[PDB]
Design a protein around this nucleic acid. Structure first.
Ligand SMILES: [Mg+2]
Ligand SMILES: [Mg+2]
Lengths: 50, 50, 1341, 251, 268
DNA sequence: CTCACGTATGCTATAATGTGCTGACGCGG
DNA sequence: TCCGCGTCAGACTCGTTTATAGCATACGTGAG
RNA sequence: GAGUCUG
């Protein structure tokens, strides 16, 4: 995003800064649910080979 | 590379347990292949000592 | 100006932004939607009306007979919600529909004067929605979640690369109806336009135009602009349009008049173009060689021969030009196709098109959908017309047509549900415009393209399916039968419609068990939006783009409330102020800004409308009754945010809260919390179990009261007035004359629900809020639900918390709690479990529920009464028998050891077994209730009969008290009317009230009032009789159960669970923990004043977590309690009402720019001391979300409490007495006990039952299962050495049948030797491979 | 098999075998009856369709939908899928003498110990109790020993304390990514329903006590006990096998 | 790319000749006399009729192809027992046969457990009655309400509606269900303890008492005999066998009171 | 040794004779 | 175009709705 | 099989 968040938690985040935060947050959480499986599939391919 | 290397093992019990079980068993059945149970997965399948 | 329930306890508001619009009814969506489905509208096709008019009238295949719809009616519900829940039946109304069988003559042309038969037929019961928003299906409360799907209309999309490493953007159009086949247009790498009907095989796009009867020349005239070529004398000329060339390179020397404008081989810039246009250039002379390649538009033929010289859409040559000239044509219409802006797409597509005429095109279309089957012309016309041009199989709906017309830039919103020939071409036109570069692709995630279906639309659809199944049956029977004997009801079947609707409300994905842990859980569940289920996405189908927050979600969908799971992003909580537009798009309120002045005029804007205006932010500072204070206001438009001038501003956010959902609105200092942690906070509030004592939150937001009231779990006063009678069971209010209607008796009775089972086996208990003889207004809380304080929502309990390590007892989020919490029974929770015992009928004979049970101790049978049922109030523990039962046994061939044993005790015990319902092992409780369901023919148990005696007498008492309080209340009114114009005070009270039918007065309005009250009295007299007969019938009524089942006994156990190590606790900033240890009071850190802390939480679980909200909550919580401690001190010493008033006014009116004013004064002295008594256990404060309390306001409040500005205190170790070497942050965090109790999760197994085929032990604690030893876990043993441990786990511990028993015997024998075997799953594998016909043998040594 | 409700429940292989037998027998009939060849052909197609559905349903095109609309599970489907028999019932299994519960800290523990709930351990070591009970002559036989445990008599606790002494128990956490996701401990009997984990091994399990749970497993044989104490013990698996740096580290 | 067995077959049926009245009579007379071609042509020409009835008989038991083939069996019986001498048309007579054979097959094959048509026919009447009741009673038929209308026994109506319940698929439900015929190791171990104890108990009581007691119950002997049947061995008594059987059990009752069972192992 | 009970195969006659839910995953070989 | 892959345990709930003729002889086993 | 969940 071209506009950074000038403020900090102590000062206080607004609804705009918070809404913009959410994107990154949820992509992170979705990443944990969805991405975990290719890592694990690599462990399993490795195990079978060796 | 890993996936093919695991399927190239001369044990069809390991090949079947990994993936592609239908195809592995047709090619083993047609070859009249004999698995002498040398690897770890093979022994774990028959419930024997590793 | 405050309400009576607010006079008892006022929350201090740190909000500064005045609320122009109040929070609406939160359970608006469910109620409006379903209400539209059942709502009787004559015109407005909504739910059933629409459904009948759509299908009906159904006319026979012969055309003699037809069935037509008149009107429908819902019968009143056979059973109330209560009886439905108990009995385990669906709460529904019978659907009776008037239908008219009309018959035509075949001999007369269309004579309708033969037979008209009209009758009211039953078609199913439809499940009804409760006033709360739920459906009771088979005695279980369920919620049908609103759905989010792609709105019908058109969409223009494009694979951004993907296909062809060429990296070509292939544009496509998708026409989506509400019902029908999908119509796709798409480009190919070679720029050929293709059509996929119903995403089948590809066909050239032009083929569909031929099917709609377009000649080649007409197609070209539609997409292409024409260029005229005049052949004058000998030189070639062409009619020039100044621009066309534009950004092209001049292939010839372009000469106009006599004078050369372009140089040959140079690019024509803007100057050349304006020069040519101003000179008015219309003819330009050109070489003959430039036409080699130009495409002819029309068919040009030789007027002499009358044969075709060149067909339309044919590439010209020097020789075709010559032949054309000499024939006598000196004007040639050719196609304008200059790459770049005007691409020859359709021209190239016609060359790819194998078809010639209309028929050839219709045949090819027919052959695509039905490949193989020979064409007929009738078949091909019928199929093509029935795809997109049939009113019955295709329907864009109002929203489809509306979005379609707006996408093609039309003026008219409303139109046909079927696709017009004009529609299809306009869509192709726009596709091609987008390929050319003018026009853009629409977004799929954009809420302007995602629509909400709540219940009523979905119930409507299932109901249409039912009708369609009926239509086939009906039409079939209308044709076969004789018309005159046969009436309409013998043709209709109710079972298809009932089955369609039953399958929706019961089998459907979107119909799920209501989540009832707590009020907020309910309210948030009912306002859920799911993109999943039928007609929606799947977890497999669901990408990353849909899941993420879209710009348009602002004010409509919560960005911070989504399951952290596979459903992350598909399930969404609705925003606070959000609502559904008439078409079902989401919309949000905004304040109109007129001439820079910000009006209170409020407009709900849809996703698409929002894009167009510039909307200021809610935090934008308004200037005292007019315009914005600041010159450059921070606003948002075109989906992005920056500074704007004041004149540019169109609108503004209504509240600061509108972005957030309900659940997140309850988080105090949300502003200071990371969005991830906040998500889990809002998610865990839903898991909060209500405690024995519902404790308000000291640090609230203000949504607390809204949520408690709208959830419905609180009893709220409709009429108000003064409370005549309080009881731990009921509240009777006497209504005030101003709202009290002069027709019926003006006494409201609210019956409270006492201690009832929830779906999660939590406890639902209503207690009375008000005292005896309290004056109340409309919308005052009369009784508190389970997790509600005086009107406010109370999910858990606030506690004195200190942030500091303990001796590792708060290691990783682990929580250290004081014994005082357990003593004070705070977070003690009530749970009610339901156990059933079923008496079935078997091939051997019926099972008996006697107390007479073979092989059972007197200890066990002590607790069962005559029938074999446990007594009410009886404490029970695992293995105790609740309902005694015996299953008849047949000839049982016993062994020599069994025959010798049965001989020794002589306890042959007849031909019966022991199948008694006994308390599950380790669960221990008190029996609160017993219910018995018997069949109709079978002789009732002695215990069943005494139960009915109780229900009958209790029913009689209930109804009797109704008629008594209603008669007393009604004559109390007649008494006041008679005094009006007839003073008889003492004289009327002396004669009996029963002999008041004679009493009247003069013929005026007051005599008519007496008549109203007398007709009501007698109405109630008979009503009481028929009510009592109904109750008596239901109590006697034998219930129809499953086949096989003679009777069922349901036992309800009650359990009090104490808080304990392993139990899961959290705050509202997503801060979880498991309790590690319960510390003695002596051991806990204590203040200078000697007061011990309740909970010790770990400092290190804050700065990493970036939920700073919890710390602000703690500082403010201590300040709140500071002021409560001052009020408690002033109340203990009595002191002056004047002095308390002073302190309390200075307190409420503290904040720098406090919005909320509280001009204490007007409060009467009695109101003030009731208020102080509530404020004593800590002054409750409200910190709105994004308009919360500032640090400086919290420190100012602390100073008012004489607490430190740092909110850190000196603490002393309880154990040593020595001080901690630095100040510790202490205050009050509102804490929640979640449903995840250790009591429910601990499980252990040595040996048990084993699986059917695989012979491995079962899974799960309910099946007494062994833990799964997975691939992962095996590999660990492989990495180690551990070969015996692994084999054990593979063999004697799982399948190996002989091995496991043999090794069990060895372990009791103390041998600890394995003796392994062959795992049985393998023997099955072998059998399964031989069943495939593969010989798989074991080859021996 | 008969469900309790009086209803029956059966494998889909029964529906597929019945398809095959009906069509095959009808083919025998139409051959005995000398039927015209168009009809014979249809029956031969239908017979091949039924056998192909029975062997591998869904490979030969549209799978045969049974009762719900779901395709019938065929022979090959029981072997093939991850869920087949290989991955589910054979390369990993459900296991006896296995339990679970929520984990919580035991800062008082030494590195080689873990808090094991009384009731959980009572159940896991049932045969070991029966065994000592009969060697002390406190129990006359196994059913009397079982009833003494059911009654949870005071003497039984003393015996159970005696059995657990120097007997290692395996603790496992999902997911088991590397070998230290299983470790052996000497158990310490504790009143209460939560497992107590030593802090320093929380790193290897990636255990944080906000509700995580652990599997318990009892090594039965002398060999398995020794492999647990020597190879898999907490104390003995200090260094990461992936690197030379240790895993057990205070936090 | 016509691969589907159904579309292939229906393609082949369409490819047939359609018969007239005079043609049906000519072929039918030759057919009953025993013509090869006549039988073939009448069957092949009337396949279309089977399909029309089989098309409206789907989604009830078997598949369309399975319903068409069984329907074709009715066609064969129809051609065999057709009477061309009666002026009445073939299509009318065939329709009966096709519906009969389809219905009969649908009543047998559809359910895994063979159900008799006798019960199925009764069931039909109960369900038709339920339909008429439902139209007038807004509610659904009770068992007793149906029984009242047919003047039949409540128990008989309940038995029938009890057979209406269909079977459920195990494939999962298989893993919830556990072997009930296979006893657990703990139970099997308990039987081993008892059987072993008996052998030791037999050589603890008197020599004649453990002979007579064991061989009666079939504990040591091969066959479980009765008081009178113990006479076959050496006892050859009725009174002395009964006194000695109970004398063995009385001394053994005191052996269980002293070891610590009796009332302890009475609950069991 | 005989009859009842459970189960099955039989025959009836206006003419009728051509089918038919959910759609969209993504990467590699 | 086709087909081979996609992390590891745990909790709970729901589900297996609907259809069709009547009466005579014939085939076959079981009970008294 | 479709759920709502805890890592
Ligand atoms: Mg962290
Ligand atoms: Mg965790």
């Amino acid at each position: 995003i071209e506009t950074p968040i000038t403020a900090n938690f102590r000062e206080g985040l607004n609804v705009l800064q918070y809404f913009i935060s959410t994107h990154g947050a949820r992509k992170g959480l979705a990443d944990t649910a969805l991405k975990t499986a290719n890592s694990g599939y690599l462990t399993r391919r490795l195990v079978d080979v060796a | 590379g890993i996936t093919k290397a695991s399927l190239a093992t001369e044990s069809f019990i390991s090949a079947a347990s990994f993936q592609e079980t239908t195809r592995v068993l047709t090619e083993a059945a047609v070859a009249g292949k004999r698995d002498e149970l040398r690897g770890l997965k093979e022994n774990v399948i028959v419930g024997r000592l590793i | 100006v405050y309400s009576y329930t607010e006079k008892k306890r006022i929350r201090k508001d740190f909000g500064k932004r005045p609320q122009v619009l109040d929070v609406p009814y939160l359970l608006s969506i469910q109620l409006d939607s379903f209400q539209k489905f059942i709502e009787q509208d004559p015109e407005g096709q909504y739910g059933l009306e629409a459904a009948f008019r759509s299908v009906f009238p159904i006319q026979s295949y012969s055309g003699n007979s037809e069935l037509q719809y008149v009107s429908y009616r819902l019968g009143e519900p056979v059973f109330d919600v209560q009886e439905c829940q108990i009995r385990g039946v669906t709460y529904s109304a019978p659907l009776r529909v008037k239908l008219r069988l009309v018959i035509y003559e075949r001999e007369a042309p269309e004579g309708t004067v033969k037979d008209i038969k009209e009758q009211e037929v039953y078609m199913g019961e439809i499940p009804l929605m409760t006033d709360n928003g739920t459906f009771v299906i088979n005695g279980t409360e369920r919620v049908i979640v609103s759905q989010l799907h792609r709105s019908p209309g058109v969409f223009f999309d494009s694979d951004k690369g993907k296909t062809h490493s060429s990296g070509k953007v292939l544009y496509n159009a998708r026409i989506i109806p509400y019902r029908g086949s999908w119509l796709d247009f798409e480009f190919d790498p070679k720029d050929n336009l293709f059509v996929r009907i119903d995403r089948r095989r590809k066909l050239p796009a032009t083929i569909i135009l031929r099917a709609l009867n377009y000649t080649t020349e007409q197609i070209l005239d539609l997409f292409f602009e024409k260029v005229i070529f005049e052949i004058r004398d000998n030189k070639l000329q062409m009619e020039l349009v100044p621009e066309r060339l534009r950004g092209e390179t001049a292939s010839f020397d372009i000469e106009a008049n006599g004078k050369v404008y372009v140089e040959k081989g140079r690019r024509i810039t803007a100057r050349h173009i304006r020069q040519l246009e101003k000179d008015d250039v219309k003819l330009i002379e050109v070489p003959v060689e430039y036409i080699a390649g130009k495409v002819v538009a029309k068919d040009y033929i030789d007027e002499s021969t009358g044969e075709l010289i060149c067909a339309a859409n044919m590439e010209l040559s020097l020789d075709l030009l010559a032949k054309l000239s000499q024939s006598g044509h000196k004007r040639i219409e050719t196609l304008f196709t200059n790459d770049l802006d005007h691409g020859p797409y359709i021209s190239e597509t016609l060359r790819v098109d194998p078809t010639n005429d209309r028929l050839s095109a219709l045949v090819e279309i027919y052959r695509m959908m039905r490949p193989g089957e020979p064409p007929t012309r009738e078949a091909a016309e019928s199929l093509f017309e029935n795809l997109f041009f049939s009113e019955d199989r295709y329907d864009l709906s109002a929203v489809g047509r509306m979005k379609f017309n707006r996408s093609l830039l039309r003026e008219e919103i409303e139109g046909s549900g079927i696709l017009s020939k004009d529609d299809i071409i306009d869509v192709m036109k726009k596709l091609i415009d987008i390929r050319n570069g003018k026009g853009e692709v629409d977004d799929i995630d954009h809420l302007g393209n995602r629509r909400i279906r709540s219940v009523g639309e979905m119930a409507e659809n299932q109901f249409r399916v039912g009708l369609v199944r009926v239509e086939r049956a009906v039409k079939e029977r209308l044709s076969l039968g004789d018309l005159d004997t046969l009436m309409p009801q013998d043709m209709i079947n109710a079972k298809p419609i009932s089955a369609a609707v039953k399958e929706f409300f019961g089998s459907s994905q979107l119909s799920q068990f209501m989540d009832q842990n707590n009020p907020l859980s309910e309210i948030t569940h009912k306002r859920r939006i799911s993109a999943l289920g039928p007609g929606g996405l799947t977890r497999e189908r669901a990408g990353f783009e849909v899941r993420d927050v879209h710009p348009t979600h602002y004010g409509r969908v919560c960005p911070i409330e989504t399951p952290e799971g596979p459903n992350i992003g598909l399930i969404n909580s609705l925003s606070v102020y959000a609502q559904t537009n008439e078409y079902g798009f989401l919309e949000t309120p905004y304040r109109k800004v007129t001439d820079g002045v910000v009006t209170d005029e409020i407009h709900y804007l849809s996703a698409i409308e929002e894009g167009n205006y510039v909307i200021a932010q809610a935090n934008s500072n308004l200037d005292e009754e007019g315009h914005f204070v600041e010159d450059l206001v921070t606003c948002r438009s075109k989906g992005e945010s920056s500074l704007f001038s004041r004149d540019q501003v169109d609108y503004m956010d209504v509240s600061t809260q509108q972005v957030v959902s309900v659940g997140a609105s309850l988080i105090p200092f949300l502003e200071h919390d990371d969005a991830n942690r906040a998500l889990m906070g809002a998610n865990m509030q839903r898991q909060a179990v209500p405690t024995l004592r519902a404790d308000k939150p000291l640090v609230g937001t203000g949504m607390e009261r809204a949520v408690a009231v709208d959830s419905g779990v609180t009893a709220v006063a409709k009429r108000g007035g003064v409370v005549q009678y309080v009881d731990a069971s009921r509240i009777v209010i006497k209504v005030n004359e101003d709202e009290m209607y002069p027709g019926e008796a003006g006494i409201d009775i609210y019956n409270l629900t006492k201690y009832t089972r929830s779906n999660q086996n939590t406890c639902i208990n209503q207690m009375p809020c008000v005292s005896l003889g309290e004056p109340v207004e409309r919308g005052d809380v009369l009784a508190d639900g389970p997790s509600t304080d005086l009107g406010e929502l109370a999910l858990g309990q606030n506690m004195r918390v200190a942030f500091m390590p303990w001796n590792g007892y708060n290691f990783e989020d682990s929580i250290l709690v004081s014994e005082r919490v357990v003593q004070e029974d705070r977070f003690t929770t009530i749970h009610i479990q339901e156990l059933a015992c079923v008496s079935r009928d078997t091939k051997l004979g019926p099972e008996e529920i006697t107390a007479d049970i073979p092989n059972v101790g007197e200890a066990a049978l002590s607790k069962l009464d005559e029938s074999g049922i446990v007594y009410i109030g009886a404490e029970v523990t695992g293995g105790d028998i609740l309902v005694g039962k015996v299953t008849p046994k047949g000839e049982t061939q016993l062994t020599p050891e069994e025959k010798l044993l049965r001989a020794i005790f002589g306890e042959k015990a007849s031909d019966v077994k022991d199948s008694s319902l006994r308390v599950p092992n380790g669960v221990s409780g008190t029996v609160i209730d017993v219910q018995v369901f018997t069949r109709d023919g079978v002789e009732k148990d002695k215990r069943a009969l005494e139960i009915e005696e109780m229900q009958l007498k209790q029913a009689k008492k209930d109804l009797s008290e109704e008629l008594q309080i209603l008669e007393a209340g009604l004559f109390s009114r007649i008494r006041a009317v008679l005094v009006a114009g007839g003073v008889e005070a003492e004289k009327l009270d002396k004669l009996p009230r029963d002999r008041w039918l004679e009493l009247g007065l003069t013929d005026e309005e007051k005599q008519n009032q007496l008549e109203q009250l007398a007709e009501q009295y007698d109405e109630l007299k008979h009503e009481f009789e028929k009510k009592l007969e109904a109750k008596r019938r239901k109590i006697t009524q034998g219930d129809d159960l499953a086949p096989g089942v003679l009777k069922i006994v349901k036992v309800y156990l009650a359990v009090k669970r104490r808080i304990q190590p392993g139990d899961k606790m959290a705050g509202r900033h997503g801060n979880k923990g498991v309790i590690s240890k319960i510390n003695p009071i002596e051991d806990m850190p204590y203040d200078e004043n000697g007061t011990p802390v309740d909970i010790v939480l770990n400092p290190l679980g804050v700065p990493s977590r970036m939920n700073i909200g919890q710390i602000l909550e703690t500082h403010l919580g201590m300040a709140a309690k500071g002021i409560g401690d001052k009020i408690n001190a002033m109340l203990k010493q009595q002191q002056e009402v004047a002095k308390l008033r002073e302190f309390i006014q200075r307190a409420y009116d503290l904040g720098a720019d406090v919005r909320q004013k509280v001009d204490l004064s007007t409060f009467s002295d009695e109101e003030v001391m009731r208020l102080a008594e509530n404020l004593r256990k800590g002054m409750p404060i409200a910190t709105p979300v994004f308009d919360g309390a500032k640090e400086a306001e919290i420190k100012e409040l602390l100073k008012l409490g004489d607490l430190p500005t740092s909110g850190q205190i000196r603490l002393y170790d309880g154990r040593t007495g020595e001080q901690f070497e630095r100040p510790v942050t202490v205050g009050y965090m509102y804490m929640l006990k979640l449903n995840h109790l250790v009591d429910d999760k601990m499980h252990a197994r040595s040996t048990g039952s084993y699986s059917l085929v695989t012979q491995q032990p079962l899974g799960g604690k309910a099946q007494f299962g062994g833990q799964r030893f997975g691939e992962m876990e095996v590999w660990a043993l492989e990495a180690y050495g551990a070969a015996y441990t692994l084999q054990e786990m593979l063999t004697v511990k799982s399948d190996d049948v002989n091995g496991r028993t043999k090794m069990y015997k060895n372990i009791v024998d103390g041998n600890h030797q394995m003796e392994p075997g062959m795992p049985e799953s393998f023997n099955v594998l072998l059998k399964e491979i031989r069943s495939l016909g593969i010989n798989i043998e074991l080859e021996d040594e | 098999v008969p469900l309790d409700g009086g209803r029956f429940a059966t494998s889909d292989l029964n529906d597929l075998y019945r398809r095959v037998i009906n069509r095959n027998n009808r083919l025998k009939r139409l051959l005995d009856l000398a039927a015209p060849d168009i009809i014979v052909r249809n029956e031969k197609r239908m017979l091949q369709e039924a056998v192909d559905a029975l062997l591998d349903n869904g490979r030969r095109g549209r799978a045969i939908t049974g009762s719900n609309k779901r395709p019938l599970k065929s022979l090959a489907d029981m072997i093939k899928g991850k869920q087949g028999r290989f991955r589910q019932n054979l390369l990993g299994k459900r296991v006896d003498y296995s339990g679970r519960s929520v984990i919580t800290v035991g800062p008082y523990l030494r590195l080689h110990q873990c808090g094991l709930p009384k009731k959980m351990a009572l159940e896991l070591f049932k045969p070991f109790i029966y065994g000592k009970l009969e060697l002390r002559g406190l129990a006359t036989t196994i059913k009397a020993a079982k009833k003494m445990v059911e009654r949870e008599e005071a003497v039984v606790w003393d015996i159970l304390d005696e059995v657990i002494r120097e007997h290692p128990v395996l603790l496992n956490r999902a997911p088991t990514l590397h070998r230290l996701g299983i470790q052996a401990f000497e158990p310490v009997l504790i009143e209460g329903k939560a497992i107590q984990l030593h802090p320093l091994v929380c790193a290897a399990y990636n255990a944080d006590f906000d509700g995580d749970q652990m599997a318990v497993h009892v090594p039965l044989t002398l060999e398995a006990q020794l492999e647990a104490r020597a190879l898999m013990m907490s104390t003995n698996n200090i260094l990461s096998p992936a690197n030379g740096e240790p895993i057990i580290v205070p936090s | 790319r016509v691969l589907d067995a159904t579309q292939l077959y229906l393609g082949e049926i369409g490819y047939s000749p359609l018969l007239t009245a005079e043609e049906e009579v000519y072929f039918a007379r030759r057919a009953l006399r025993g013509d090869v071609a006549s039988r073939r042509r009448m069957i092949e020409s009337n396949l279309r009729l089977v399909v029309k009835i089989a098309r409206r008989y789907g989604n009830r038991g078997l598949a369309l192809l399975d319903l068409i083939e069984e329907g074709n069996l009715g066609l064969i019986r129809a051609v065999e027992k057709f009477d061309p001498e009666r002026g009445f048309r073939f299509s009318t007579y065939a329709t009966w046969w096709i519906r009969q054979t389809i219905e009969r097959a649908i009543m047998n094959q559809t359910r895994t457990i063979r159900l008799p048509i006798h019960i199925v026919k009764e069931l039909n009447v109960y369900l038709r009655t339920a339909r008429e009741l439902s139209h007038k009673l807004d509610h659904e038929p009770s068992a007793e309400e149906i029984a009242e209308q047919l003047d039949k026994p409540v128990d008989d109506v309940s038995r029938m509606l009890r057979l209406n319940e269909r079977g459920t698929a195990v494939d999962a439900l298989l893993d919830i269900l556990a072997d009930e015929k296979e006893n657990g190791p703990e139970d099997t171990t308990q039987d081993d303890d008892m059987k072993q104890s008996i052998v030791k108990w037999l050589f603890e009581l008197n020599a004649k008492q453990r002979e007579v007691l064991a061989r009666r119950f079939g504990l040591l002997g091969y066959e479980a005999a009765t008081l009178e049947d113990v006479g076959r061995e050496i006892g050859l008594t009725r009174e002395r066998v009964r006194q000695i059987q109970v004398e063995g059990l009385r001394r053994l009752r005191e052996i269980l009171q002293t070891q610590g069972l009796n009332i302890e192992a009475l609950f069991l």
